[PDB]
Amino acid sequence: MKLKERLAELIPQWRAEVAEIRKKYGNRKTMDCTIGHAYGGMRGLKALVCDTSEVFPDEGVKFRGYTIPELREGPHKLPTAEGGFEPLPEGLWYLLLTGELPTEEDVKEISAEFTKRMQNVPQYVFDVLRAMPVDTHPMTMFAAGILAMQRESVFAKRYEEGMRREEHWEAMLEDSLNMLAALPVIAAYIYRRKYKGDTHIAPDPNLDWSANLAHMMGFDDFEVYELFRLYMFLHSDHEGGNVSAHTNLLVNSAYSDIYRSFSAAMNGLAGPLHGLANQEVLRWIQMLYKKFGGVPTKEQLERFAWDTLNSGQVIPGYGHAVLRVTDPRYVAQRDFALKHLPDDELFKIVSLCYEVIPEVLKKHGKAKNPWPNVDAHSGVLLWHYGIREYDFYTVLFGVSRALGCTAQAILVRGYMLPIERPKSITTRWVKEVAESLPVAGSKLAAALE
Amino acid sequence: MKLKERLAELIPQWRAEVAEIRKKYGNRKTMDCTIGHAYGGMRGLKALVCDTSEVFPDEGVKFRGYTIPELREGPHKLPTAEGGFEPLPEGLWYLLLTGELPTEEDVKEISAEFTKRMQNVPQYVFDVLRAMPVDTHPMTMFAAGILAMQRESVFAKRYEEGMRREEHWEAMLEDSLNMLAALPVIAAYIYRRKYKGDTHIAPDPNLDWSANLAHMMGFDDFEVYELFRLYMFLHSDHEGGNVSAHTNLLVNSAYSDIYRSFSAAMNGLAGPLHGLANQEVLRWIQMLYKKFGGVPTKEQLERFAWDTLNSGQVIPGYGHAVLRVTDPRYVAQRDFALKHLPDDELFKIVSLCYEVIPEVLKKHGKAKNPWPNVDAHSGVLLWHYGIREYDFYTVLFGVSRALGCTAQAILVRGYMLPIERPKSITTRWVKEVAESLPVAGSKLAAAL
Numbered sequence A: 001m002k003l004k005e006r007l008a009e010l011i012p013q014w015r016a017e018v019a020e021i022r023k024k025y026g027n028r029k030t031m032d033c034t035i036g037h038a039y040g041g042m043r044g045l046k047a048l049v050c051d052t053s054e055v056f057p058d059e060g061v062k063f064r065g066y067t068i069p070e071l072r073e074g075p076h077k078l079p080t081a082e083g084g085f086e087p088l089p090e091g092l093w094y095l096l097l098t099g100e101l102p103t104e105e106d107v108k109e110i111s112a113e114f115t116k117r118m119q120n121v122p123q124y125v126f127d128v129l130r131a132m133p134v135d136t137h138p139m140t141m142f143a144a145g146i147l148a149m150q151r152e153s154v155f156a157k158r159y160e161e162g163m164r165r166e167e168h169w170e171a172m173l174e175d176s177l178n179m180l181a182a183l184p185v186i187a188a189y190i191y192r193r194k195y196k197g198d199t200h201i202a203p204d205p206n207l208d209w210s211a212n213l214a215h216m217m218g219f220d221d222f223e224v225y226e227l228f229r230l231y232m233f234l235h236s237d238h239e240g241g242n243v244s245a246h247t248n249l250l251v252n253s254a255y256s257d258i259y260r261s262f263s264a265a266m267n268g269l270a271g272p273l274h275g276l277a278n279q280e281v282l283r284w285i286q287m288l289y290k291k292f293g294g295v296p297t298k299e300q301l302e303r304f305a306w307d308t309l310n311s312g313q314v315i316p317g318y319g320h321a322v323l324r325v326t327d328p329r330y331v332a333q334r335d336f337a338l339k340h341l342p343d344d345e346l347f348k349i350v351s352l353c354y355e356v357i358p359e360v361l362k363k364h365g366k367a368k369n370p371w372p373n374v375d376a377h378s379g380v381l382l383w384h385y386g387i388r389e390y391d392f393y394t395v396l397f398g399v400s401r402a403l404g405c406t407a408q409a410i411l412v413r414g415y416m417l418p419i420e421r422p423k424s425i426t427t428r429w430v431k432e433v434a435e436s437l438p439v440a441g442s443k444l445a446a447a448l449e
Numbered sequence B: 001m002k003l004k005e006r007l008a009e010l011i012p013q014w015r016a017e018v019a020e021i022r023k024k025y026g027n028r029k030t031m032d033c034t035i036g037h038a039y040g041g042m043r044g045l046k047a048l049v050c051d052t053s054e055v056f057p058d059e060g061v062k063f064r065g066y067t068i069p070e071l072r073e074g075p076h077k078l079p080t081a082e083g084g085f086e087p088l089p090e091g092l093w094y095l096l097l098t099g100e101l102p103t104e105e106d107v108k109e110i111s112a113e114f115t116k117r118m119q120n121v122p123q124y125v126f127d128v129l130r131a132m133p134v135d136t137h138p139m140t141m142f143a144a145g146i147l148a149m150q151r152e153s154v155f156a157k158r159y160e161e162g163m164r165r166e167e168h169w170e171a172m173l174e175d176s177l178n179m180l181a182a183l184p185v186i187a188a189y190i191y192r193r194k195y196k197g198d199t200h201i202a203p204d205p206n207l208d209w210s211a212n213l214a215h216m217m218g219f220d221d222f223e224v225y226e227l228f229r230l231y232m233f234l235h236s237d238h239e240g241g242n243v244s245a246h247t248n249l250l251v252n253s254a255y256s257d258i259y260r261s262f263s264a265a266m267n268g269l270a271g272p273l274h275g276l277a278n279q280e281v282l283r284w285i286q287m288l289y290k291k292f293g294g295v296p297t298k299e300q301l302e303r304f305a306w307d308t309l310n311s312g313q314v315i316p317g318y319g320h321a322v323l324r325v326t327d328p329r330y331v332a333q334r335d336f337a338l339k340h341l342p343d344d345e346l347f348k349i350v351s352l353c354y355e356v357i358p359e360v361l362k363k364h365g366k367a368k369n370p371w372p373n374v375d376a377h378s379g380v381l382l383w384h385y386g387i388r389e390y391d392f393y394t395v396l397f398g399v400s401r402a403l404g405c406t407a408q409a410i411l412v413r414g415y416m417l418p419i420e421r422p423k424s425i426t427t428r429w430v431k432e433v434a435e436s437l438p439v440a441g442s443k444l445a446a447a448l
């Protein structure tokens, strides 16, 4: 398989580069660590490595250096489905791992690997899923199915057998192919059992990864196939620091296999502060429609935007801290909506927000970012095509994010990064030692080296 | 319950006291964050808060300021079981939570709480356990059983209904009581199904928590009850930065409940670099035994030590990623072994390792810590009383670690710490800017 032959060349090299960097640049200072970091969820602390993707304040997220437009439309457009426009997540995955753009042949090889392996979900995984009460939250069901599949781990087996650290990345790759193939099967099972009368649809062997998930969920429509292709591409990866990504690396760093690390990641994504943003934006859009008996006027949205901001509150999916432009994941969803569902009423509200909400934020003068993120746009696309089960939105997110989490876990075992073991501190020590400590970026701080 | 009354007063205080520290002292610097930290698993980086315990390199772990000798033997001895010496983990949990030594009454109230709620493991949790193939790794089964019981989460439910941030710690304690009560039941089920012909033994309502685990595994001797008590006491907690404690805090920080954060932690504990040490040591000790036709001499082991080191191998059970002298968890086990099984052959090798192996590892000079950790001692004890199922040792570890993980997660939801979200950096950036960056502790850093 092309991907694997290539990685067999790239990874020894990267491994050697990282060993040198660590040796020659390890004592290089990047920032001050503070009391506020320790009590403040490490916000801003550069404590982690991720090479798959990278957020730039002025451009948004990039995937191995390429922008979304380059891959979606521009001169480096990733392969599509036949007749398709949207990039195949399969191709992105080739990109995230190798840093090179795939050939049509490269994508086809990965599609075949995915389709084949999708037929190989153990029967016992379904037994595990049916044993859970049907009212269990779907993200609990999703994490449990994944974890039960740990029995098939090639990594865990070869580790018990004795393998060289140099083989880690290969076992991780095999496990990743298996797991990613399985994910839309496990997710669809959950969807069907919970929401569609416990009728089960087999994988179509002539559909790509993304399309098989819509199909098995019971949505056979070309637009849906495209939406899901775009969705999975967009939400694939967003650095290493978000809870789900970090959970994955953290558990990976102890040599736990991908079924253990990613299911752990999903218990993190299941958290209300991490995995619910899409849903809240959608519920808000729906609350605007019902409030104004329809799409509001330009004037009503401004007034309801001013009331909300002036009353201490925020507008969901707008004005996150980091970026200084519109999230390029937002832009690609807008372009999908305009093309495919422009007259949908909830879309019209989101559209109206893109005009109105940035103007009111600039005039309100607090947020250096007046622009939306990805979660502003995703919920209405799902609801339009009939995916209306809020709780399940996080599962779709989860299936996407596996692309990035698997890429990253393959890479860092290729690099042989060590176990994550930070130092914790006590409130006692802080209180004993606080006064004694220099303020950061201060003359005293400069004094103490 | 005394515990909860006590927390109902202490938590609003600590919460106010933490908010004060973040405001007043947040911008105080502790250390240089370096490129090394990012590529080196954050080793040394002060990125986390934990008040349950603290590892002092030249003293070892302390539990709310109290040493292991203080709590087990010396001037602050925690409640034991009727007729017992070894401290009950129920009382240590009280300590961890409140910062205060419990009475007999305090401890008894918690035992009773564990014992009652131990009857309340849902039938569907056993359905899930039985749907996994019996050859599944025990730590996968454990994590999965815990995770299935997320459906009974009080915290997740109260969060959906709308609850005040102040109510969080209450819903976390409730969930923790339920989950701690269930773990011995889930673990014993795994044990009996995997290794003991799938015959199952019910909780005994008149035993304490640790002893019930032993009972439900099929071990009823008093000395085993005592071992489990000690074992659970020693493995309870070890700061906030080990992979299992950290995974628990991380997942907890996004408001995921203790069934989610602790099952995530167990997946981390399942990792060879975190949860496997006890077994490696036992195998190694048994390998010496077989090799020397019994207990070696000082000379034989001294030689063997050197030949292992100079062949680029690890001496398992010695050295740590933070500890710097003898692990006081090791000394507690040695005491137990001298007291209860001084003539066990494998123990005698462990003992002999204690004399010889430190001095050897000093001279070799690669190990930063030349002394033994806790995993040097735990295996021979388990093996001696007939717990011989290597892979299951990590589950025992996990049951015990739940004590600290639940304590930490209750407290932090009391303090209202926010989501954990560090920044990742790229190799590309590092290659772009590294030369231009100041060396940590330089004149250039002092100017910048």
Ligand SMILES: CC(C)(COP(=O)(O)OP(=O)(O)OC[C@H]1O[C@@H](n2cnc3c(N)ncnc32)[C@H](O)[C@@H]1OP(=O)(O)O)[C@@H](O)C(=O)NCCC(=O)NCCS
Residues within 6 Å of the ligand: B277, B309, B313, B314, B315, B316, B317, B318, B319, B320, B321, B322, B366, B367, B368, B369, B373, B375
């Ligand atoms: C716990 C442990 C993993 C910590 O590793 P660490 O933080 O990298 O350790 P150090 O800072 O002491 O490493 C410095 C050197 O000492 C070596 N070292 C430490 N203890 C050693 C031992 N018992 N035998 C051989 N070499 C040892 C390391 O391999 C390293 O050499 P390297 O640069 O060639 O890799 C390590 O002590 C170990 O492997 N112990 C044996 C297994 C064990 O008992 N684990 C239980 C841990 S709870």
Ligand SMILES: O=C([O-])CC(=O)C(=O)O
Residues within 6 Å of the ligand: A238, A239, A241, A242, A243, A274, A374
């Ligand atoms: O929090 C982050 O860094 C990124 C993220 O989760 C998201 O895109 O939803």
Ligand SMILES: O=C([O-])CC(=O)C(=O)O
Residues within 6 Å of the ligand: A421, B237, B238, B241, B242, B243, B321, B373
């Ligand atoms: O703290 C560590 O790094 C490992 C350990 O001993 C423990 O978790 O008990």
